[PDB]
Write a protein that binds this ligand. Sequence first.
Ligand SMILES: O=C(O)/C(S)=C\c1ccc(Cl)cc1
Ligand SMILES: O=C(O)/C(S)=C\c1ccc(Cl)cc1
Ligand SMILES: [Ca+2]
Ligand SMILES: [Ca+2]
Ligand SMILES: [Ca+2]
Ligand SMILES: [Ca+2]
Ligand SMILES: [Ca+2]
Ligand SMILES: [Ca+2]
Ligand SMILES: [Ca+2]
Ligand SMILES: [Ca+2]
Lengths: 173, 173
Amino acid sequence: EEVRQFRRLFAQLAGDDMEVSATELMNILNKVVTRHPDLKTDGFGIDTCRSMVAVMDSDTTGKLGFEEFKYLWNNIKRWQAIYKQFDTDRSGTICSSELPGAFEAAGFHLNEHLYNMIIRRYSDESGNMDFDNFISCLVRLDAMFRAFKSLDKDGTGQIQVNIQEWLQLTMYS
Amino acid sequence: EEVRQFRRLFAQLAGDDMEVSATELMNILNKVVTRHPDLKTDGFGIDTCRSMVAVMDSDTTGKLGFEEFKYLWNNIKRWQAIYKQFDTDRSGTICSSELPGAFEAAGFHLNEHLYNMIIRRYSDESGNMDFDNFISCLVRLDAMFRAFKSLDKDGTGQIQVNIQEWLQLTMYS
Ligand SMILES: O=C(O)/C(S)=C\c1ccc(Cl)cc1
Ligand SMILES: O=C(O)/C(S)=C\c1ccc(Cl)cc1
Ligand SMILES: [Ca+2]
Ligand SMILES: [Ca+2]
Ligand SMILES: [Ca+2]
Ligand SMILES: [Ca+2]
Ligand SMILES: [Ca+2]
Ligand SMILES: [Ca+2]
Ligand SMILES: [Ca+2]
Ligand SMILES: [Ca+2]
């Protein structure tokens, strides 16, 4: 009864409006990381969770319905496993050297330039990335892959994006 | 002596590497808003300030040099004055009703669907937006418009990108 127990997880987490808000997501995540001492974090901030919710909120209800949440949560579960696997010095954080292997293992094969860009945006002055920043980066990276894929109808490797779609994809995220 | 003084602030804030990090930006932003009770805020969070740095970091030092900082700073001061001006309610926050005047006065004219996304992503359940969310929203919007315009010089309203570029545009940010 796994999908049962997951259905229970969602229902109790979503509460009275049956959708998962930025705050409810923030709270469950902080609650869960608390039990994983191998994962260092300063915590999931509200801003970060609003951004994770918008980027998963396919129907734009402001909040995460069952499928949108299930997709997010199944990814976080695989990604968490990967972070542990690739923290091979047990700093509880992913440094620049560990990051490629980790992201590849989640199925994003980026080049050097991009790996650097990501380190610049999401890692600290030491080149170290803690767990909330890794999850947040990955959720967005995956959404941006998926959004490109949707727009490349013809499979040319190029998308045309109008300003309305651009603003929608960049501001609601 | 507006120039002298602004160069002196910059120097003292930027410290020994002569650039403003996300953390230095965070601290001066929270220091400043304290002396402005009318700008209601739960504080500028480090996440929000890394995003602010990233979107303004044109030379990709990972940090804001003098010009990059001055440019961000001057927008913040302008938008800050717009925030009070359009908080005609004087609640210290911007509600869904005051929002479009504020954005119109920052020169952004957006359709209703975009407004709804932005209210959803930046405002609380009362439809109120506080100062750090506001500034964070506009620094992002302004950047996203400058990104797109930069790539669509002759106002076709469309850009064409491959995945590398799209990831640069949407993840560095
Ligand atoms: O947290 C859980 O209850 C489950 S079943 C998997 C899991 C482990 C770690 C994180 Cl951060 C999220 C989910
Ligand atoms: O910070 C300043 O020196 C001035 S003049 C205006 C101002 C007020 C609030 C913020 Cl957050 C930034 C600038
Ligand atoms: Ca709920
Ligand atoms: Ca939704
Ligand atoms: Ca490590
Ligand atoms: Ca963090
Ligand atoms: Ca500095
Ligand atoms: Ca810079
Ligand atoms: Ca108001
Ligand atoms: Ca806020």
